[PDB]
Amino acid sequence: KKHYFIIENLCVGCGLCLDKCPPKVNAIGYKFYGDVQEGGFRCYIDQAACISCSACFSGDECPSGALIEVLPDGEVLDFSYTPPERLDFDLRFLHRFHRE
Amino acid sequence: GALFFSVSFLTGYIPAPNHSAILTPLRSFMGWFLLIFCASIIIMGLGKMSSAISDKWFLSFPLSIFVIVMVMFLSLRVYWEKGRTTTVDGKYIRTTAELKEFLNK
Amino acid sequence: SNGKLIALAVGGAVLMGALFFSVSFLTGYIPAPNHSAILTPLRSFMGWFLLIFCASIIIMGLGKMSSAISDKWFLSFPLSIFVIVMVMFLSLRVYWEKGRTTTVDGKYIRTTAELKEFLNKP
Amino acid sequence: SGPWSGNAVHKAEKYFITSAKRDRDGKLQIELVPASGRRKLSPTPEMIRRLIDGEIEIYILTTQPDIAIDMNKEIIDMENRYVIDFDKRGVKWTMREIPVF
Amino acid sequence: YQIFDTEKLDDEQVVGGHLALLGVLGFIMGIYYISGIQVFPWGAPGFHDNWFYLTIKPRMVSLGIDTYSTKTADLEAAGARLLGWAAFHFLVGSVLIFGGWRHWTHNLTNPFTGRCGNFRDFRFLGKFGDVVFNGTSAKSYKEALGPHAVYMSLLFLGWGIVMWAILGFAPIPDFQTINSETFMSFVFAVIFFALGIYWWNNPPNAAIHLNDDMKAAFSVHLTAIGYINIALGCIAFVAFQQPSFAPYYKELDKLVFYLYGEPFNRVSFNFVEQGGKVISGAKEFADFPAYAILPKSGEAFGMARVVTNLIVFNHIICGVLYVFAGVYHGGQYLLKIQLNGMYNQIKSIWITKGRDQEVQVKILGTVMALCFATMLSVYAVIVWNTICELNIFGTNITMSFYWLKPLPIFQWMFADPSINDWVMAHVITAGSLFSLIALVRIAFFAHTSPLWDDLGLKKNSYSFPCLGPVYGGTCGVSIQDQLWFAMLWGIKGLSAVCWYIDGAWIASMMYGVPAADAKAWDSIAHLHHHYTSGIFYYFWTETVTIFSSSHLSTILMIGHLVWFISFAVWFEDRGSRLEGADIQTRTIRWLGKKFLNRDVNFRFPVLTISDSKLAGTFLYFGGTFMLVFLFLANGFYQTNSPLPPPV
Amino acid sequence: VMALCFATMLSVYAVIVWNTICELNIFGTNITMSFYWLKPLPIFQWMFADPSINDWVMAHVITAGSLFSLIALVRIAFFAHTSPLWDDLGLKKNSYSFPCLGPVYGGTCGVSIQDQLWFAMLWGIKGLSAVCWYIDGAWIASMMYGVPAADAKAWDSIAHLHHHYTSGIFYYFWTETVTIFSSSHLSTILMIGHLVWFISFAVWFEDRGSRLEGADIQTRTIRWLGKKFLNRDVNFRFPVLTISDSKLAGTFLYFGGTFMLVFLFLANGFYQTNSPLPPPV
Amino acid sequence: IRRLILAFILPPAAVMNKEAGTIMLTGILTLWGWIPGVVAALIMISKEQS
């Protein structure tokens, strides 16, 4: 179903998702490579322990986008809702407000 | 508790005049324990406040602040300090010229 | 090209000096009992810059000290401080405080008894 | 104005290669989906143009029904770095949940 | 600390909360008025002087409610007047709190008729709303601006009537008396009436607000009102020092103020409080009853400038805090609209024009470059002046920036133009720039920063203490953390304000020091006013009098404790505290069980880094400014007699 | 260690604050409510000259500070790799200098050996300053002994002190700076030490992320300005100290800046006269 | 001629053509070193447009 995962490539090991995991579940854990300041520490979801409660992902807490949700049909969601894509331009008026 | 008064029995100290050698350590430890109790009450009561403060009060809490500050000033006047220093004779000094006059006295 | 970096830095310092001089003329102030109004603003600007420059070069040199420090500095680091400290002490004797500060006569006030006898001149 | 459109962490909109099936035997079953998760697209030539231009960023998850290894063009001289075509590059997101407790 | 969030409350709830707070504040005003009663209406001696009433005594005597007259007669009358006005404030505050409860509970049913009016649709005051509004603001704050302007016009009009009749100050044009405040009260009515009508007929538009904007409008208006407070502080400083205000602020110096906590007539140890009490022992100063609060002349205390400084710094601190809070809450709104995606959909300059990250970077870089330049200039000037006055490196005061007065075109702002005023202006600009670095970071880098958009990270939670040691450390990167840093940076501009208004010589750290040429500034710079000692020696001189007061000494100790307690939470110690608190829990458990069979099942709580930063900044600010209160409440202690040359 | 430290610290600090309150006569408490009767016992009096509450507070403050720093030293000794909490939370300390783990479990700042050393130094600043103020002749039993307010200047009379101590804790700064300001070099040390000490806050405070995010802006501003009005020049990155290096530098600055000035306390003078003042009747 | 005089009274109004950052900088310049410094800013930028 939900089957929330973490992209180890992008995790920064902040742990903002770990605190949301229910205390007994504790599926999310810390994996250390070395030299914490160099980014060795990372986040992993033990899929066996996960109970698809959505607390980790629905929190909107992942800064890197590593925390993803694979929908039952299958689609990776990096966020609960990404902002719409826009074609932007600076509206500078001609005469009155912001000329040129 | 009653350790400090035994300390006072030891640690030979010349008691200050007109103060009992027993009650002076009693007063000292009394104030010590009063400070400890006041700190404990402050910490635990503010913990309970943070745990219990919610949208349900919305005015009884400001009204509690109002009543406590009102009684602060009320105790300032009634119990702590009485009258604007008046004078042993009774005259009040309210100008700098009168204060200078009494300085000349 | 770092020539433009130094050009901009020296131009900025020169412009600071010129601005200080110009505003010193603008700001109406009695110069001093003796000192002039042409040199005093420049003395203040010299202090200003020398301070900023000394702090900047100290920061930069200590950063490069931390960058270049190695085991090969075994004798380079300690002895250097030694010499600088030595120089400092010598600079105290020959430049800053030239003597022991005896009286004008040269009586070498060196005990509290004679200090008491001295401070109470008749 | 570009960091505030879409997810702010991906300068180029990211497209995970979610589903691919060998049964259709054409590999058109490769079904790219953006991180937003609202368009089950396909690897069309326009998507190829976007990928080469750098506008998009196609990615692959490790924990999934296998997309196509050596069946969708693969470079294995180094660690595998799957490519739709040699000029393309599908950077595989690595996902170590099973190897670690 | 988020229970009364804007989202949690609707417009009627906010109306009711503000109304109930106005009532509470009216009760506080009555309390202060009663605290100001030196002699009771019944004859007996009254309350001593409190800063809470010495702050408003000038204004009260301006309105005739209080009197600077010193006889028991007419001071009894002033006390009766203060009691009457305090009772009026009490009852009106009761009514305001009743209305606030009704609005907060939405039970806007008339107790007499029972008709339940609608916040959305309501005729104002009856027929007046029909004449003017023709029907209420169906919705929208924009349609509410005009009605609020009309309400403020009616407030101005009512104050004009009250001062004309109740307080007996007729409307007279001349601006040297309270009478003009009546005149202008009517003027600003018509203005804030007419404009209101205009804004009712032609509403204004800033579409960022009006939509889901209790926080957004609150932020903008809080920043605006913070600048209003800063302007009010400057105006108060200028005006209260003008001759027209001397009858109400300079005449404080002629009075003697018995303030709580001031020196009390001491008594020997062998003292018995019976009858005359003379036989047992001797009181410190005779002619005053034992333990009585001794008189303090306003001339020495400088109560004119003390009260002026207290009011001015109150408004300045409140305004700076309000600016910082407005930028913070606006940053919270910005982050919300960035997360939900409305940021790109806003079509107003206040959001669109800084949409580009390039312009945000350029803005913050310009602010940072100006801050570096101005801070370096002022600090070089100050340290060089210190090097000169202390004669360090062989220097002397002649090399200091005594020549660097503000230009003749800018000396109007300053009574005695010297290098002190130059350093004041430039230090204020530099502190403003410093705090603006953090404020601009909140404004722009609320959801993503150029480092973070390069580093592939986004700021979501608006309170997250960090993202960890990734990239060498991500401490204090939320907008809340930037607000805390902005407050800790504005501490310094606010200090500069305090030290300037209390008479300090902030151009050098060691003015008035008994060393080298520190006491020569008055001769070389040709100063008229003898500024209070310099930045480092100002502590000493002001503590000469802080230490002489038991109450001010208590404040000193308490604020210092509060300040240094802040490091336990601000320092990078949270993990150490958590580990130690686990050890504390285990210690309590086993020690208690061995000492007492009862089990504990309780844990010592450790603040999160977010709460740690919150409490740490609160404590830092609290200690710092509870002590600035000592600086401003010791006395002005700046005399108009320059010190001769040291030699 | 924690319990002994809590007991000693709470008792001695309560003694100090109570003596301060009685000094100031705050809450109406005259000086006789103070612990003028707390003196070193006739068994341990020989360790001190003029035994009084100052000596008792000295001994207990030193014990409390030693046990305080010993909390961190013992944490270094034992909880170098695994702590009971870090074991329960299933985490390992793989380095002596690792700053933290992250915003996990509410924060994990300063859990390493190096950070515990820094906290040990910061805590032992108190014991060392107590030593300095005892040796230069201060009244550490109260905050404002010798203050010209209330009954404080009656201490010598109430405690029968044979020597006049320079001042209480808070008043010690003032009375011992009367002579620092009279000296130019000591004033330079004062200013420089305070500069160093408060600059320690830039790194010790939880602000590394802010400084990093701002150094990015500094780099970009340098490039843009060096390209715009300076012509055709762009390079250089503004470095920012890591949290480990930030903590190290902050501890160095803190310790030096506080002990750049303790030297001033000890180098301005003993100033502990042996003529006790009369009562302030 | 309107732009330069409006600039000498209202420099940021003159640089209104320029980017919002430049307009804010010119406003700050009015605030600090009013006229001389900010008049310098406006003349530099306007002459640069020329």
Ligand code: BCL
């Ligand atoms: C400190 C620096 C900033 C500041 C920083 C923050 C931060 C940080 C936060 C808020 C939050 C809020 N702020 Mg703010 N804000 C400032 C100024 C203001 C002002 C103003 C005076 O004009 C207002 C109206 C607000 C309004 C608000 C709300 C929109 C919101 C929720 C508050 C509430 O429910 O808290 C409930 C608690 C309160 C009532 C305040 C605490 C005071 C107590 C209850 C007062 C009475 C007791 C006693 C007298 C004093 C306290 C100490 C005693 C020992 C008990 N801020 C100051 C100047 N603000 C929070 C929010 O959720 O943001 C979305 C939040 O996280």
Ligand code: BCL
């Ligand atoms: C002077 C004009 C100021 C202003 C001054 C204040 C002050 C001051 C306060 C508020 C408060 C509130 N303000 Mg406001 N407010 C302004 C404009 C706005 C606007 C708007 C423009 O539409 C909005 C939406 C708000 C929003 C709000 C709410 C968050 C809150 C009222 C709800 C209520 O009382 O909860 C029900 C809550 C209660 C009645 C409990 C109150 C408890 C105590 C008595 C007060 C708590 C806060 C603190 C002690 C006050 C500190 C002031 C400092 C001394 C600087 N403000 C401007 C910027 N506003 C209050 C609030 O709750 O702050 C957190 C508050 O105290």
Ligand code: BCL
């Ligand atoms: C101090 C009193 C409080 C207060 C307390 C009450 C009480 C109590 C009641 C209401 C009722 C109502 N309030 Mg109210 N309310 C206040 C301010 C407001 C404001 C505002 C202008 O910001 C709004 C939007 C409202 C909204 C509303 C309406 C929905 C409703 C009246 C319907 C209507 O046709 O009435 C026409 C008149 C109104 C719109 C009232 C406007 C507010 C005036 C100032 C109330 C004054 C009451 C006071 C005792 C008399 C003094 C009059 C002197 C001339 C000063 N109130 C004032 C400041 N409100 C009333 C009700 O339900 O009416 C059917 C009601 O009984």
Ligand code: BCL
């Ligand atoms: C000027 C009158 C008001 C004001 C009214 C508003 C309004 C209205 C809005 C904001 C909003 C915001 N305000 Mg404001 N605000 C003021 C003071 C400030 C100060 C400050 C310390 O001076 C700061 C840091 C902020 C910060 C902020 C942000 C939280 C937010 C914009 C984010 C963004 O993306 O901007 C993008 C960046 C910019 C648009 C940069 C350019 C600035 C604009 C074009 C106007 C000012 C410059 C002007 C032309 C200068 C030259 C002439 C001089 C006037 C002499 N305000 C004063 C008190 N503010 C918005 C928000 O969302 O509120 C919650 C909002 O709706």
Ligand code: BCL
């Ligand atoms: C209730 C009484 C007071 C007190 C009264 C005194 C007095 C008075 C003196 C000391 C002395 C000492 N106390 Mg003690 N002491 C208190 C609390 C403590 C605590 C603590 C658990 O917090 C500790 C660790 C200490 C430790 C110490 C040393 C600092 C000092 C050196 C000799 C020694 O210990 O001799 C005794 C040593 C032991 C019995 C074993 C080790 C220490 C034990 C754990 C605690 C000793 C205090 C004990 C309660 C004293 C009993 C004597 C009373 C006068 C009846 N005290 C309490 C608050 N203590 C002496 C000192 O040097 O004075 C300058 C001294 O004369």
Ligand code: G2O
């Ligand atoms: C008055 C000031 C201080 C204390 C009081 C104190 C007390 C204390 N601290 Mg602290 N601290 C600083 C100030 C004070 N820290 C500073 C300025 C820094 C910046 C570096 C700092 C830093 C760290 C780190 C990094 C760690 C700790 C801990 C830790 C404790 C847990 C157990 C213990 O140590 O008990 C030993 C400590 C005692 C029980 C102290 C005895 C009470 C006192 C006599 C009186 C209390 C007065 C009161 C605070 C005033 C108002 C109260 C009321 C009226 C509202 C613990 C009770 C840590 C632990 O949990 O591990 C042991 C940990 O890891 N810290």
Ligand code: G2O
């Ligand atoms: C004298 C003491 C201080 C500075 C000097 C300074 C300088 C500075 N700081 Mg600081 N700081 C504190 C003290 C000082 N912080 C404290 C006590 C706290 C505890 C809360 C604190 C905290 C934060 C946070 C949280 C952040 C920052 C930043 C940030 C800057 C980058 C941007 C800027 O301000 O440029 C504007 C340029 C200036 C500020 C530099 C002009 C120098 C002047 C002439 C004083 C010279 C000082 C000394 C004489 C140098 C020795 C030379 C020789 C003897 C070896 C930046 C230059 C941050 C940024 O990068 O954000 C954009 C950020 O996020 N901080």
Ligand SMILES: CCCCCCCCCCCC(=O)OC[C@H]1O[C@H](OC(C)(C)CCC\C(C)=C/C=C/C(C)=C/C=C/C(C)=C/C=C/C=C(C)/C=C/C=C(C)/C=C/c2c(C)ccc(C)c2C)[C@H](O)[C@@H](O)[C@@H]1O
């Ligand atoms: C505390 C002293 C400052 C030191 C602060 C350090 C600066 C950052 C240093 C990096 C910090 C760091 O982290 O790393 C250190 C790293 O160092 C090294 O790398 C280098 C890049 C080579 C260092 C050299 C940098 C530079 C050349 C030196 C510094 C830059 C300089 C030149 C600073 C000074 C600039 C100036 C003087 C600023 C001020 C200039 C602007 C002013 C005054 C405005 C005037 C206003 C005008 C227009 C008119 C005014 C007016 C008005 C308004 C109205 C009316 C009237 C009448 C008037 C006159 C190693 O390689 C690495 O190993 C090591 O790590």
Ligand code: SF4
């Ligand atoms: S969905 Fe729930 S149980 Fe599963 S990893 Fe996320 S928070 Fe833990």
Ligand code: SF4
């Ligand atoms: S030191 Fe503390 S605040 Fe900084 S990144 Fe580590 S856990 Fe977060």
Ligand SMILES: [Ca+2]
């Ligand atoms: Ca000494």
